[PDB]
Curated annotation (Swiss-Prot), chain B:
Compartment(s): Cell membrane
Organism: Bacillus subtilis (strain 168)
Topology class, membrane: Multi-pass membrane protein
Domain Histidine kinase: 19-192
Organism lineage string: Bacteria, Bacillati, Bacillota, Bacilli, Bacillales
Enzyme Commission number(s) of this protein: 2.7.13.3
Chain positions with Phosphohistidine modification: V21
Gene name of this polypeptide: desK
Name of the protein: Sensor histidine kinase DesK
Length: 193, 192
């Protein structure tokens, strides 16, 4: 029926959401308990744990909210085709040495990495004045690591809206963002896999 | 059509997956609101803060327990099937089954059918093991914004099951009421 064949991927996305929300609920449960045990002992620390529970809740809902209707996100292979066309239109040479594609990556995590990849490249175009942009995608043991390196110049002050958005979605997936702006801008994004 | 049949199966599984996402989201948001409230009360009223956080813990525990069993298959029990099951149990028990068919609830989540099915099963099991009843009446009603199942037997109340029922109905934002005035009547209600 075709239209029902795409339900297979929507189902994989829905399961990923169930899995992630389950883990967040569970973490929030553990922190509320610890906080409860500090109420009298250490009320300032108790407040801080609960502020963290609140942030987990808000950020999780924030990350799930946009996916839930369609149960569809961006595929990393398509985003790679996309950012190659963006660099070409910008006349910035795309450098990519293809290695073994990551194998067992959740659709949620592909969407997160795709959005980060898109934002990183968008910044190369808008801010870097780079001549080149190298994209590395690595399956590294238990993680996937994408490095976006441009040979332009970093234009920012100390700060981090793109960069905060990336850090937030990556840390929601228990991954991380590193930025090095010494000689061009190298963005390293790592997510569990 | 040979494949289309089986793809409607994924259709129901996807509907259950969505119900779980929706319910886990709701609970996450509830626990957030309750945590924030506990936070604001740490100094004015630490006792209430403690109780709001105990309630947060309970919501976490029970939510994960209700999801745990469904997640792998994304499949629950359908209420129509459980009604058939309980009729056959009541027949083996030689307890008269009283059921007047009315309009079936139109738009009940698969998650909520599973919860109602489990409660209906436990209610009738209790009729069979405990009541010494001769009749068992089952009513299933769409009443405005809720579905209500009533299970009434003509035995005598003798007082696992009852708290399990109460927890799962409360997880779906509904309720359990027991009336033991003249036999045992369980009214279970769930939003819909
Ligand atoms: N690849 C890059 N090359 C040079 N400067 C950058 C790069 N990425 C980000 N920046 C700098 O850091 C700032 C913050 O990035 P971002 O968070 O996307 O905000 P915005 O694009 O809306 O300025 C940018 O305004 C820019 O000054
Ligand atoms: N339909 C019923 N008729 C009579 N007594 C009941 C009925 N349902 C529950 N009870 C009483 O309440 C007790 C608690 O029931 P339940 O929670 O299901 O635990 P259990 O069946 O394991 O005792 C029963 O043991 C019984 O004493
Ligand atoms: Ca930007
Ligand atoms: Ca029982």
């Amino acid at each position: 029926i075709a239209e029902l064949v795409k339900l297979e991927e929507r189902q994989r996305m829905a399961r990923d959401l169930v899995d992630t929300l389950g883990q967040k609920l569970s973490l929030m449960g553990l922190k509320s308990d610890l906080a409860r045990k500090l109420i009298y002992k250490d009320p300032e620390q108790a407040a801080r744990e609960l502020k963290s529970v609140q942030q987990t809740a808000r950020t999780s809902l924030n990350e799930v909210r946009k996916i839930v209707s369609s149960m569809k996100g961006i595929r990393l292979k398509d985003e790679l085709i996309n950012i190659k066309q963006i660099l070409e239109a910008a006349d910035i040479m795309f450098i990519y040495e293809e290695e073994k594609w990551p194998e067992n990556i959740s659709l949620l995590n592909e969407n997160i990495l795709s959005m980060c990849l898109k934002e990183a490249v968008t910044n190369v175009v808008k801010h870097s004045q780079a001549k080149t942009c190298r994209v590395d995608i690595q399956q590294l043991w238990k993680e996937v690591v994408i490095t976006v390196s441009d040979d332009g110049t970093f234009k920012g002050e100390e700060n981090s809206h793109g960069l905060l958005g990336m850090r937030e979605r990556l840390e929601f997936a228990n991954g991380s963002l590193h930025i090095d702006t010494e000689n061009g801008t190298k963005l390293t994004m790592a997510i569990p896999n």
